[PDB]
């Protein structure tokens, strides 16, 4: 929609989009995450995490190492540009970040860091 996107994470470990475009005129960009379904956070948790395509693996490995209680994200990880909390079904969370944190010609990825989900739950984010 205008400088924002609503995205869903379901019980089959799927996001309903796999490509996000952010227009350079946006001062800010907002992602609104929801989780349709019935499974709880500890079985099917999903968060929306954004980093460069280069940093994603490091973010995923260290996130797995943080624990459920840490939302499977390394606290104050410098490589995460923006992220929601980890949510279960029926829950909701949003994040607004400044678009100046992204630069032209850099590849970005969004993904879920919940153990085992990033292999299937990821997509690209692009500044146009």
Annotated binding site for Cu cation: 46, 112, 117, 121
Which of the stretches 21-29, 56-64, 94-102, 117-125 binds Zn ion when contact is defined by CB under 5 A? Answer: 117-125
Per CB under 5 A, contacts with Zn ion among 88-107 are none
SS3 assignment, position 99: helix
Strands (E), the chain: 4-8, 19-22, 28-34, 49-52, 82-83, 92-98, 108-111, 122-127
| Angstrom distance (rounded) from CA 46 to CA 85 | 8
85: left (phi over 0), alpha (psi -120 to 50) or beta: beta
Q: Does 112 engage in binding with Zn ion (CB under 5 A)?
A: yes
Q: How far is the CB of 41 from Zn ion (least distance, A)?
A: 9
- Known binding residues are 46, 112, 117, 121
Q: Does 110 engage in binding with Zn ion (CB under 5 A)?
A: no
Site map (CB under 5 A) of Zn ion, residues 61-90, x = contact: ------------------------------
Torsion of CA 61, 31, 87, 16, to 10 degrees: -90
Site map (CB under 5 A) of Zn ion, residues 2-41, x = contact: ----------------------------------------
């Amino acid at each position: 929609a205008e400088c924002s996107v609503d995205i869903q994470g379901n019980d089959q470990m799927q996001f309903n989009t796999n490509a996000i475009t952010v227009d350079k005129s946006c001062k800010q960009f907002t992602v609104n995450l929801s989780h349709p379904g019935n499974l709880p956070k500890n079985v099917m948790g999903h968060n929306w995490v954004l980093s460069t395509a280069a940093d994603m693996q490091g973010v995923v490995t260290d996130g797995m190492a943080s624990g459920l209680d840490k939302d499977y994200l390394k606290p104050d990880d410098s490589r995460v540009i923006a992220h929601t909390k980890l949510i279960g079904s029926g829950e909701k969370d949003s994040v607004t970040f400044d678009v100046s944190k992204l630069k032209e010609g850099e590849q970005y990825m969004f993904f879920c860091t919940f153990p085992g989900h990033s292999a299937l739950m990821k997509g690209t984010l692009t500044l146009k």
